[PDB]
Write a protein that binds this ligand. Structure first.
Ligand SMILES: NC(=[NH2+])NCCC[C@H](N)C(=O)O
Ligand SMILES: [Cl-]
Length: 240
């Protein structure tokens, strides 16, 4: 019943994430290779340090992140998770740690084309299974051809192969792909987005002791400009 005590006793904070989402979380060559890195990971490390424990990153696909939290495979879920009303029926969320827009990644040659909703409606769109960007397309563009894919890298791969024309994703991720790759760009078209649905850490309900610690760390990071600095550090790093 006491999250903070259980965490101290097992000597680790277990954080479920989906590392297909630079600059939030992704894989990098770090003193060797195969390391999960990113702004969410730095923030999780800050939470583990506050609790005086080791950080364990449990990687999985995004549509299983909240499921694993719900069933006790993780203490927290940190994966650029939008704090929605519907999600708040099942989970508690920390205060927001970062707020951003949702945009489309397209080929550079198509940037002049994909400027409105009308252009997307006949295009082949992809979004990640179990995400807010996926729901927005389903809800606002129900006659667009939507392919839902488990892994975000796989969606961008289909974009590059030309099977997909546009990929809906959090803007910092689209900006990262566009910056790291010559023939990709962020489109100007955007769908209607919900106010205050920002990124937050998810917890199981009645985890108030642990929520307080997570909130304290997040507040300090926001007050020091540190989450923003984490994202900029991440954008310097090389994906794998
Ligand atoms: N690591 C990831 N793939 N994260 C996807 C997050 C997508 C969106 N922000 C959501 O909460 O549904
Ligand atoms: Cl761009």
């Amino acid at each position: 019943q006491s999250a903070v005590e259980a965490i101290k006793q097992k000597g680790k904070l277990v954080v479920a994430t989906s590392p297909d989402y630079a600059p939030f979380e992704f894989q990098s060559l770090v003193d060797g290779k195969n390391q999960v890195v990113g702004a969410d990971i730095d923030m999780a490390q800050a939470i583990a340090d506050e609790l005086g424990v080791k950080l364990e990153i449990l990687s999985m696909s995004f549509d299983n992140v909240l499921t694993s939290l719900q069933t006790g495979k993780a203490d927290l879920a940190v994966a650029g998770i939008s704090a929605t009303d519907e999600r708040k029926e099942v989970f508690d969320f920390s205060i927001p740690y970062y707020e951003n827009k949702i945009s489309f990644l397209v080929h550079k040659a198509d940037v002049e084309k994909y400027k409105d909703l009308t252009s997307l409606e006949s295009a082949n769109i992809a979004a990640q299974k179990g995400t807010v960007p996926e729901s927005m397309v389903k809800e606002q563009l129900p006659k667009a051809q939507l392919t839902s894919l488990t892994n975000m890298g796989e969606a961008v791969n289909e974009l590059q192969a030309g099977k997909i024309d546009a990929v809906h994703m959090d803007e910092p991720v689209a900006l990262s792909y566009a910056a790291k790759n010559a023939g990709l760009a962020v489109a100007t078209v955007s769908l209607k987005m919900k106010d205050g649905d920002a990124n937050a850490v998810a917890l199981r309900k009645n985890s108030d002791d642990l929520k307080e610690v997570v909130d304290k760390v997040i507040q300090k990071l926001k007050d020091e400009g540190t989450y923003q600095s984490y994202l900029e550090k991440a954008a310097s790093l090389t994906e794998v």
